[PDB]
Nucleic acid binder design. Structure first.
Ligand SMILES: [Mg+2]
Ligand SMILES: [Mg+2]
Ligand SMILES: [Mg+2]
Ligand SMILES: [Mg+2]
Ligand SMILES: [Mg+2]
Ligand SMILES: [Mg+2]
Ligand SMILES: [Mg+2]
Ligand SMILES: [Mg+2]
Ligand SMILES: [Mg+2]
Ligand SMILES: [Mg+2]
Ligand SMILES: [Mg+2]
Ligand SMILES: [Mg+2]
Ligand SMILES: [Mg+2]
Ligand SMILES: [Mg+2]
Ligand SMILES: [Mg+2]
Ligand SMILES: [Mg+2]
Ligand SMILES: [Mg+2]
Ligand SMILES: [Mg+2]
Ligand SMILES: [Mg+2]
Ligand SMILES: [Mg+2]
Ligand SMILES: [Mg+2]
Ligand SMILES: [Mg+2]
Ligand SMILES: [Mg+2]
Ligand SMILES: [Mg+2]
Ligand SMILES: [Mg+2]
Ligand SMILES: [Mg+2]
Ligand SMILES: [Mg+2]
Ligand SMILES: [Mg+2]
Ligand SMILES: [Mg+2]
Ligand SMILES: [Mg+2]
Ligand SMILES: [Mg+2]
Ligand SMILES: [Mg+2]
Ligand SMILES: [Mg+2]
Ligand SMILES: [Mg+2]
Ligand SMILES: [Mg+2]
Ligand SMILES: [Mg+2]
Ligand SMILES: [Mg+2]
Ligand SMILES: [Mg+2]
Ligand SMILES: [Mg+2]
Ligand SMILES: [Mg+2]
Ligand SMILES: [Mg+2]
Ligand SMILES: [Mg+2]
Ligand SMILES: [Mg+2]
Ligand SMILES: [Mg+2]
Ligand SMILES: [Mg+2]
Ligand SMILES: [Mg+2]
Ligand SMILES: [Mg+2]
Ligand SMILES: [Mg+2]
Ligand SMILES: [Mg+2]
Ligand SMILES: [Mg+2]
Ligand SMILES: [Mg+2]
Ligand SMILES: [Mg+2]
Ligand SMILES: [Mg+2]
Ligand SMILES: [Mg+2]
Ligand SMILES: [Mg+2]
Lengths: 81, 80, 205, 87
RNA sequence: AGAAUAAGCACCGGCUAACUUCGUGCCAGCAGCCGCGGUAAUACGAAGGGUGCAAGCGUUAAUCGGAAUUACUGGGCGUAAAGCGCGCGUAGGUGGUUCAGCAAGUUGGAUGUGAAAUCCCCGGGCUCAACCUGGGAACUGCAUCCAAAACUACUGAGCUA
RNA sequence: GAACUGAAGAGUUUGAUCAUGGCUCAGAUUGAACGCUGGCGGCAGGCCUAACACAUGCAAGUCGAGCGGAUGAAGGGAGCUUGCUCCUGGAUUCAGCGGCGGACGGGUGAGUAAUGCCUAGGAAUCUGCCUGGUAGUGGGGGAUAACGUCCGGAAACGGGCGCUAAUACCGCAUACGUCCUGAGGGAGAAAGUGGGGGAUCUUCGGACCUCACGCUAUCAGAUGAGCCUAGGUCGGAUUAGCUAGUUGGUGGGGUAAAGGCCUACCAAGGCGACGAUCCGUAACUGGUCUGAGAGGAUGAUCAGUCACACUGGAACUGAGACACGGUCCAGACUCCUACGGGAGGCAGCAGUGGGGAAUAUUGGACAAUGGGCGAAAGCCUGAUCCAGCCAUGCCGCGUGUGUGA
């Protein structure tokens, strides 16, 4: 199916993640159709931990896209805020 | 609103088909002067009403044969 | 890296101010600082335009103790920055951490200021910074360690720099061994003898 | 092969081939009988062959041996030929 | 605890920043181009002394620049290379002047695209930088429509240089 | 609001001069190599040549909630005794059938000058797993693997006979959706497993109600793929003619789909100095390096598309392959053999020989992000995350400091 998961940008031992809506039969950071936001596992200073776009995510879920487990946790945590 | 293309009939010796020349003037990529290029297309003339020299307007459709995917919609000028 | 060697042979070659000693006695009565070094020293040696560019570029580099890869990076950044790159280069090169801890009066020489800054004895907001290239943003309170405030080398450097002039844009509290930078210096503030335009002429070729 | 799943897939494939071949032969047999019925210029036997051939054709189309558009095309063309023969 | 423990390479006749002596004597050797050397060589080989870069320094191979030296921007052809020996003419290029129409070129606007990254501008994080990253700008391109009619093209009717 | 703002010349033809004109130089860059020398850290990069041949080791499995079979513990009890066996039960493990995955991820650039790539479009198509609706999941049968037995073989194993299971296979039961048939009528499917339970027939064996997974027919949505048209895509004219399935039509065949895609007849058409055909060379693009710009060179890293998988062909399985560690045939080269016959494909990650001026370890773990499988624990992952060697590149810091005639 088409699924929403994490693409690993950043540098060695300094991760960064793009929340990508990709066809599941693609590479980790291969072609996609749309990007909804990002997650920063280092934060610190004025850097924001996570941000997403709500309306596009709702559209993608309304078109039946399976989010990964970590992506599901982070999106529900963001929806809490 | 069909995407037409206007042209001049060149040869029609094949049954239910017509050859149309379409002339365009393209700008040279560097020297800035326009040169007249031409394109030859084959169109489906169902009732072979197009003789040589006529000026017509065609339309894009699905392929009717190999290298024949246009159909004339109506003649707009005849020939002497 | 860094330069090691005689600190007045350079002055003799260049024949100008070229601050490289503590300045205890004078600038002159150490090395007869009017002749270029070596056997062939008395000759004035009239030199072409390329000589002019090379001589003043070496002058600025030696007074500020910067290597040439770093210096050319500085020049590229200055050219990137808008508004008359010639003085942008000086303004940006002035904001180095070691030259600030010198000009704030905490060190006898640029080399001794680098000595202090490298061995982790100076702060910016309490955070250990020991890179003698840090570009100090305006506002930061540069200070020495509360542990290091009792060292006598800082005391002697401060009393020696007590009579060297006033820059009239920083606000320095001397009791606590702290500095403060408000806004970047203007072109007129620095010594208006060496021109900046001849450098940018050198690097535009 | 090297991985045992490759061997299992292979043997299941020969089993599936030996199965599918018989049913493809059966459908081809029925349409061939129908076609030679029309080409022989007889109507009643053409009717009977068509009525006896459509059920197996459609059952096989649903079974997944052939694709449904193919079966529909066969039905339509053969019906057209017989209707043309009717006159 | 201990300054302890960690500087090399090229060059110095001009172009190009930096000179003296000793040894050979058109030999041995140098060299990117001009070129040095035959008994005081700042050019050879060494010494001292300098100049330039620096954990690197040179050398070779390759691309663009300088080269307006393939010249659209932006060159030339009497004597430096360069006008066919000379006509006629096919395709092609170019077209005196007036009135009117059309709207292909032309101009302005709207809409869709021009994947992401990279380039550019303003910020954020690692002691700074390299590096990572947010937002924006840009991607001169292409297609579809709406409006204008000065010039070119197309259509009709004229005029005489 | 900011997105740029940018352009240098010198030496050398002459006794000397001006012009023309070639050569050389000062800059920025390389996946670079060589010589002298050598302290450290961070981030990157690392067979450009022989798509030359390859030792060993690893790089795709998973499901007992699909199915028989065999492993059957702990035990509630008994016998004789202290150990075993057995009734009833029973937690684990898997050879085989079956369901998914293996067509993804990973590698290379040989071929390819256009069935490839880039830009803009359009009409005749298909699509598992995902989501949203709709209608159902009833009743039978014949086998077979494993399992015994016999023959044959060096092995892979092959063959004869007997029996068994299902979500394996095939009829039968009907058609809210569908297919064709002009209205008329006709045509076409399903598999059950796991958790509970009020009442009822009854061995709440089961029937019955619920939930979970799963299965069938269909509409739509995305996701992915197939097909068509116009424009652009290296050098050579010391390559000027090429084409007979070739160009168009009719009937039929074929594909999921338009089409000379295939076939039989009908006519002689079609392309080309706007460069057809032929020869050489070469994956294409975003982009990279230079330049004031216009341009010039180029396609290392990363991303999108294409092609290939020892060489040449062909099809089967499926939703999708002409299939990178699948099948069959032929070939070249290495190997085993009981001489009957068999085995192999590092352009997957380290490694070796060789070629070269020259490019590295036969290292760790699923800890994280993804992938496959299962409902859930969980397994597999040389993809990925980290280590090793290398001054290869960029950036940063050290080899100290003051005085000292
Ligand atoms: Mg350095
Ligand atoms: Mg049936
Ligand atoms: Mg079916
Ligand atoms: Mg000089
Ligand atoms: Mg030399
Ligand atoms: Mg001598
Ligand atoms: Mg010498
Ligand atoms: Mg040029
Ligand atoms: Mg050149
Ligand atoms: Mg000229
Ligand atoms: Mg002459
Ligand atoms: Mg003449
Ligand atoms: Mg002529
Ligand atoms: Mg003439
Ligand atoms: Mg003419
Ligand atoms: Mg005119
Ligand atoms: Mg004309
Ligand atoms: Mg326009
Ligand atoms: Mg972009
Ligand atoms: Mg108008
Ligand atoms: Mg002379
Ligand atoms: Mg001259
Ligand atoms: Mg098993
Ligand atoms: Mg691939
Ligand atoms: Mg290769
Ligand atoms: Mg060719
Ligand atoms: Mg079944
Ligand atoms: Mg084309
Ligand atoms: Mg024929
Ligand atoms: Mg036809
Ligand atoms: Mg036909
Ligand atoms: Mg075709
Ligand atoms: Mg050609
Ligand atoms: Mg190439
Ligand atoms: Mg090639
Ligand atoms: Mg190319
Ligand atoms: Mg290729
Ligand atoms: Mg640039
Ligand atoms: Mg230029
Ligand atoms: Mg490569
Ligand atoms: Mg790619
Ligand atoms: Mg292939
Ligand atoms: Mg093949
Ligand atoms: Mg090979
Ligand atoms: Mg093979
Ligand atoms: Mg199939
Ligand atoms: Mg395979
Ligand atoms: Mg292999
Ligand atoms: Mg390998
Ligand atoms: Mg080797
Ligand atoms: Mg060798
Ligand atoms: Mg995981
Ligand atoms: Mg394994
Ligand atoms: Mg290193
Ligand atoms: Mg080296």
């Amino acid at each position: 199916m088409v699924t929403i998961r994490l693409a690993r940008g950043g540098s060695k031992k300094r991760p960064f993640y793009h929340l990508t809506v990709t066809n599941s039969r693609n590479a980790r950071d291969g072609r996609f159709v749309e990007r909804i936001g990002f997650f920063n596992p280092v934060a610190t200073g004025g850097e924001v931990r996570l941000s997403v776009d709500q309306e596009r995510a709702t559209y993608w879920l309304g078109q039946g896209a399976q989010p990964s487990e970590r992506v599901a946790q982070l999106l529900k945590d963001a929806a809490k805020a | 609103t069909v995407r037409t293309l206007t042209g001049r009939v060149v040869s029609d010796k094949m049954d239910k088909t017509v050859t149309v020349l379409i002339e365009r003037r393209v700008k040279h990529p560097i020297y800035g002067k326009y040169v007249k290029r031409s394109t030859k297309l084959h169109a489906h003339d169902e009732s072979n009403q197009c003789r040589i020299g006529d000026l017509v307007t065609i339309r894009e459709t699905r392929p009717l044969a190999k290298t024949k995917a246009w159909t004339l919609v109506d003649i707009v000028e005849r020939a002497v | 890296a860094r330069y090691i060697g005689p600190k007045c042979k350079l002055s003799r070659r260049e024949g100008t101010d070229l601050f490289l000693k503590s300045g205890a006695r004078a600038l002159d009565s150490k090395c007869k600082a009017e002749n270029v070094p070596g056997q062939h020293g008395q000759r004035r040696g009239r030199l072409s335009d390329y000589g002019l560019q090379l001589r003043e570029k070496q002058k600025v580099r030696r007074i500020y103790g910067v290597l040439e890869r770093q210096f050319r990076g500085y020049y590229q950044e200055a050219s990137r920055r808008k508004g008359s790159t010639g003085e942008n280069l000086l303004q940006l090169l002035e904001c180095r951490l070691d030259n600030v801890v010198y000009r704030m009066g905490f060190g006898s020489t640029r080399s001794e200021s680098r000595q202090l800054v490298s061995h982790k004895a100076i702060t910016v907001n309490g955070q250990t910074v020991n890179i003698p290239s840090y570009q100090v943003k305006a506002g930061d309170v540069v200070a020495v360690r509360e542990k290091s405030k009792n060292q006598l080398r800082i005391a002697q450097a401060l009393e020696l720099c007590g009579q060297r002039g006033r820059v009239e844009w920083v606000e320095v509290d001397l009791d606590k061994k702290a500095g403060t930078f408000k806004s970047a210096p203007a072109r007129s503030d620095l010594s208006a003898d060496i021109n900046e335009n001849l450098i940018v002429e050198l690097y535009s070729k | 092969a090297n991985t045992p799943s490759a061997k299992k897939r292979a043997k299941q494939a020969e089993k599936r081939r030996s199965h599918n071949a018989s049913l493809r032969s059966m459908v081809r047999t029925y349409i061939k009988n129908v076609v030679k019925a029309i080409d022989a210029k007889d109507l009643e036997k053409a009717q009977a062959a068509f009525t006896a051939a459509v059920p197996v054709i459609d059952r096989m189309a649903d079974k997944g041996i052939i694709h449904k558009n193919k079966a529909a095309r066969h039905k339509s063309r053969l019906s057209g030929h017989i209707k043309a023969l009717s006159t």
